[PDB]
Structure 1
Amino acid sequence: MNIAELYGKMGKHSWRIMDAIFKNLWDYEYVPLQLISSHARIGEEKARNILKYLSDLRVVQNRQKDYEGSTFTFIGLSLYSLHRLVRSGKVDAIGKLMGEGKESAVFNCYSEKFGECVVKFHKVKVKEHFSVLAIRSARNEFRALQKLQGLAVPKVYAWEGNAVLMELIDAKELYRVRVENPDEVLDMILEEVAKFYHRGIVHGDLSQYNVLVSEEGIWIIDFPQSVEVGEEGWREILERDVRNIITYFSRTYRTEKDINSAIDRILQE
């Protein structure tokens, strides 16, 4: 069922129940029914009924093991985030899915103010909380993009929940394009990485899947794993972006660039 049809099934009472989940995410995964109810100002039995219906529509997940509590699914938190974008007047209509995998769903959408955009809905210290982590990814991407404005990255328009609204780039992933000047394209990527670094940003997942290319040039996208220069492991993360992109060019084009020199060059600037 499309996100636009799901959006159409939501009434004001539904939105207010979901606001009440969202505002309490910071201190529960499963927000207790009693608090959803007290925040939304909707009676308990009726809140319970709205939630069971939201569950049938896969917007929330309701649990009853320790206590009656509710949290967003991916679809739900995305729907809610879109809602906040629509109410801020930044989006008018959501459009068709452009792609989805492991980390995000990316939709086309149209804005009167910003034109034809994408909205990217994000999914996903002890190494072994879905909503708060997806919203932190979203926000991280948004701030990185903001600090990078003016370079070859999308213009960024807004952030709500797990959603970032940004400019549609008319270009394809590097991986899907055979370039005939690979050395120059590799150098234009490394130069942009140097400009990120001068702005205090490391991309954090640079690859052939998030450099976009056309006749016009390249763009870099996808910044939810980006860190600031000075954060823990930043330098090793920058090295991994440089090594990885250079390795992709070596494998695909037998480009000859030396990894350690490329990094030293970026770092000394």
Structure 2
Amino acid sequence: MNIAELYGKMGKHSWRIMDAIFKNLWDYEYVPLQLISSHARIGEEKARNILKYLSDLRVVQNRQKDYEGSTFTFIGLSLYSLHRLVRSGKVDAIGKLMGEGKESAVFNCYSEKFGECVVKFHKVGHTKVKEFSVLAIRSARNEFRALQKLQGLAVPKVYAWEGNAVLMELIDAKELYRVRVENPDEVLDMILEEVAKFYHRGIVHGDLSQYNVLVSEEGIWIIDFPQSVEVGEEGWREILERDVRNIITYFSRTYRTEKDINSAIDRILQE
């Protein structure tokens, strides 16, 4: 279904059931029916009926293998997170899907307070044994905190975070990947200067690339922070080096810009 239509099918008991799942995600991936029922203050038979219908609408996934338990689907977690944004008065209407990939779905929306914005719903974690709701939620929260810390720099203004959703400014600009520039050396230098300012604020982007820089005749913006780290966190320096190396390499291949990677890293790091 489309997200606005899905929202309109939800009654107050539906939201209560979703609240109950959300508040127990830290303890269980599949929240047991008994806990959903007791938290929602809804009888178990009724609770089960609501969860069946929510599964039919692709909002929850129910499993029975070891016990009767439920969790959100991506659609469901996004819907619930949207509901939190609406209830907090930060969003008035969800609008059209802007784009969706393996990592997120980004929707247009309108806010009386914030104007025409975007809400980005996080699909995946961006995190130990090296071999999903709490991880998508952690991605959203980390992105929100990074954007807060960087306010006043060339990033979107950030407005709210709930669940897997981050509400922020719509940037009218396209990915660098898609835009041929005639002053590539200047554009690269502006990106590197922004990286330096992030670092001064104690933030490393962690996925700097041609897909995460937006450009217009007006300037550049940098987006996409769920994988960001604080300076001091394990591997932060190598992660920063990678950001600098990757963006320089992009410019090297695309424009044959000559920029020394080691010097660029050292300049950033010294002050």
TM-score, normalized by length of structure 2?
Answer: 0.99
Alignment match, 2:232: 230
CA distance in 2: counterparts of 1:213 and 1:255, whole angstroms: 18
Query: Following TM superposition, by how much is the alpha carbon of 1:246 offset from its aligned partner in structure 2, in angstroms?
Result: 0.3
CA distance in 2: counterparts of 1:58 and 1:102, whole angstroms: 18
Query: Could you list the per-position Cα deviations for residues 159-209 of structure 1 after superposition, in whole angstroms to 9, with x for gaps in the alignment?
Result: 000000000011110000000000000000000000000000000000000
CA distance in 2: counterparts of 1:194 and 1:102, whole angstroms: 29
Query: Following TM superposition, by how much is the alpha carbon of 1:25 offset from its aligned partner in structure 2, in angstroms?
Result: 0.2
Query: Could you list the per-position Cα deviations for residues 212-263 of structure 1 after superposition, in whole angstroms to 9, with x for gaps in the alignment?
Result: 0000000000000000000000000000000000000000000000111100
Query: Following TM superposition, by how much is the alpha carbon of 1:37 offset from its aligned partner in structure 2, in angstroms?
Result: 0.2
Q: Secondary structure at the match of 2:140?
A: helix
Alignment match, 1:103: 103
Query: Following TM superposition, by how much is the alpha carbon of 1:102 offset from its aligned partner in structure 2, in angstroms?
Result: 1.2
Query: Could you list the per-position Cα deviations for residues 67-114 of structure 1 after superposition, in whole angstroms to 9, with x for gaps in the alignment?
Result: 000000000000000000000000000000001111110000000000
Aligned residues: 268
Gaps of 5+ in 1: none
CA distance in 2: counterparts of 1:262 and 1:95, whole angstroms: 41
1:192 pairs with 2:200: no
CA distance in 2: counterparts of 1:169 and 1:131, whole angstroms: 27
CA distance in 2: counterparts of 1:194 and 1:99, whole angstroms: 30
CA distance in 2: counterparts of 1:233 and 1:170, whole angstroms: 33
CA distance in 1: counterparts of 2:129 and 2:99, whole angstroms: 32
Query: Following TM superposition, by how much is the alpha carbon of 1:53 offset from its aligned partner in structure 2, in angstroms?
Result: 0.2
The aligned runs of 1:1-269 (5 Å cut-off) are 1-124=1-124, 125-128=128-131, 130-269=132-271
CA distance in 1: counterparts of 2:64 and 2:236, whole angstroms: 42
Gaps of 5+ in 2: none
Q: Secondary structure at the match of 1:230?
A: coil
CA distance in 2: counterparts of 1:264 and 1:95, whole angstroms: 44
CA distance in 1: counterparts of 2:153 and 2:147, whole angstroms: 9
Q: Secondary structure at the match of 1:66?
A: coil
CA distance in 2: counterparts of 1:186 and 1:224, whole angstroms: 23
Query: Following TM superposition, by how much is the alpha carbon of 1:31 offset from its aligned partner in structure 2, in angstroms?
Result: 0.2
Q: Secondary structure at the match of 1:196?
A: helix
Query: Could you list the per-position Cα deviations for residues 27-58 of structure 1 after superposition, in whole angstroms to 9, with x for gaps in the alignment?
Result: 00000000000000000000000000000000
Q: Secondary structure at the match of 1:118?
A: strand
Query: Could you list the per-position Cα deviations for residues 123-174 of structure 1 after superposition, in whole angstroms to 9, with x for gaps in the alignment?
Result: 111110x100000000000000000000000000000000000000111100
Q: Secondary structure at the match of 2:108?
A: strand
CA distance in 2: counterparts of 1:256 and 1:32, whole angstroms: 59
CA distance in 2: counterparts of 1:105 and 1:233, whole angstroms: 29
Query: Following TM superposition, by how much is the alpha carbon of 1:6 offset from its aligned partner in structure 2, in angstroms?
Result: 0.3
Q: Secondary structure at the match of 2:98?
A: strand
CA distance in 2: counterparts of 1:82 and 1:56, whole angstroms: 20
CA distance in 2: counterparts of 1:73 and 1:235, whole angstroms: 35
